Amino acid sequence: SRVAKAPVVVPAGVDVKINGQVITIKGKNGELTRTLNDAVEVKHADNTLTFGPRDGYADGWAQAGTARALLNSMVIGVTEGFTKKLQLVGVGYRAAVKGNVINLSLGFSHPVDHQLPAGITAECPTQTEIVLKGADKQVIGQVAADLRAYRRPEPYKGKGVRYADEVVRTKEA
Amino acid sequence: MKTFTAKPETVKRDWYVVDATGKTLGRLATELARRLRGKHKAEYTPHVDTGDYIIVLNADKVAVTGNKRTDKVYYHHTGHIGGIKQATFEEMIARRPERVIEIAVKGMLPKGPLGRAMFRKLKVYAGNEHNHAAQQPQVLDI
Amino acid sequence: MIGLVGKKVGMTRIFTEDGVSIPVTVIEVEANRVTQVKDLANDGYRAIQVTTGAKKANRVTKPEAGHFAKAGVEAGRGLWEFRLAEGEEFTVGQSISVELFADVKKVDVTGTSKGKGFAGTVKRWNFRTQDATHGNSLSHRVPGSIGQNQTPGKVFKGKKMAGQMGNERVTVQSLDVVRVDAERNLLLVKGAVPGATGSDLIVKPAVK
Amino acid sequence: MKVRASVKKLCRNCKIVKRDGVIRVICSAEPKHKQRQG
């Protein structure tokens, strides 16, 4: 509603194509495609995109708001991109990168190897720090969560894999 | 005079073909059962079979409403103590798509020898092809 | 993979230099001859059919003779079938010998077990005997109770009772291959296998 | 998790949400406040 009534500006250098309910956005950082719900109409005025309901559906405004948010994110991604940062805390915990595989040592009796998906890049500016880059918000979030699940922060010392800006509470015995 | 009765040795039967893509299951099954029994002909006689032959195509594309595609359950028992078994609509469509329409039609027909005989005129397929071109079926729009 | 058809000869032992004794079953595996190849277009699945042995001429009927003559092979004592895996090829008239097992480590063997005829519950199902004294009345090896009262009022299906025992198809899995001798057509395996001396056996590479 | 028939907010950081047909209470300050109706 309030979110769906704000149009999205299409900055110079990006190509937009619409066909039925399928949308493609192309830019210097790559190409993204999506298929929208049957209760949204999207229009390409001159340099802006607008979203609105279709008559006959009872949840038009909510779906329109969701579509607006998703398209905004696509446009930002094909120009700037998204990045995430992960940190390791503990004694003997380490990480490294080779090709598109991350190697983790996290206190187990066996090593951990993670295979990155298509379109995501990784870097290690230190043995205790990981930086991920890409153009898809959902995929970058999922990859960060998958990496964090190998060893979650624990409440007595804070050891494990955490996000850079994450507040970890502690307590005493 | 006496009321008219139909004779099994001189009845006339015809061949039809139907497409099941996107149709609601029970509202198709009622029509199929009506025409297999023969309630659409003015010669209907309860103890004689006076129905037609029907081919059904595209049985894996039949539709249901609500949450039935994951919440309708088919049950049966094997005869051994403890042998009660079940499946869902999705699973049935995945392994034996024809049984879905066959079971529904069989439940709507008379129980007995004559109903078992009426069932034999139904031919159900899963794709878009059949091998009964020598019988020359005509298209039926339900 | 495919397997072979052989015959049970007997049992013996092998002595090792370290002082161990290994009990072995001896299996004679002659050459298997291919009689038919089945493909997807004509039959709907992929398999081969084989024969082995020899048979006397005046005991072969005309249908069987024609079947063997189409292939161009001598008559044998039976026909058997094996399913093919992706990337396996054979031709009609080919021979297969025991060198197929030169590098296999474990096998499965199938045969027909010995016959005991009509048997009781003590021998057939490991039921316990009742007392031999203390006033027992004609009920020493009898089965006992076979149900409940008015609910349910019948006997369930699958109940354990007396009947025929033995003389059926059995498989024993994961047996070591002790030796392959190609000049005498012998395969030596470790342990016991189903059947009696002189019966037919089917040998395949192990599935587990 | 507390499973019970009466579920309610116990402090100012508690929230009420409905997930897949179930009424739940989730809190950002206290893990002891996590509740499920059933």
Partner: protein, 59 residues
């Protein structure tokens, strides 16, 4: 039995049994169900004429 046969014959001409009976009553026809079924089976032009009569009465 007579009623079932009449329903089958009328739906072939484009009307239901209940409407057909109402139309005959409003047109003042007094033929009974035995004779109606007989005509349905043995003479179809006459049955079509009767249906037209009932439709005109209802119109």
């Amino acid at each position: 039995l007579w009623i079932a046969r009449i329903n089958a014959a009328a739906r072939q001409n484009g009307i239901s049994y209940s409407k057909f009976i109402n139309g005959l009553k409003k047109a003042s026809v007094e033929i009974d169900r035995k004779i109606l079924a007989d005509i349905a089976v043995f003479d179809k032009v006459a049955f079509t004429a009767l249906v037209e009569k009932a439709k005109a009465a209802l119109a």
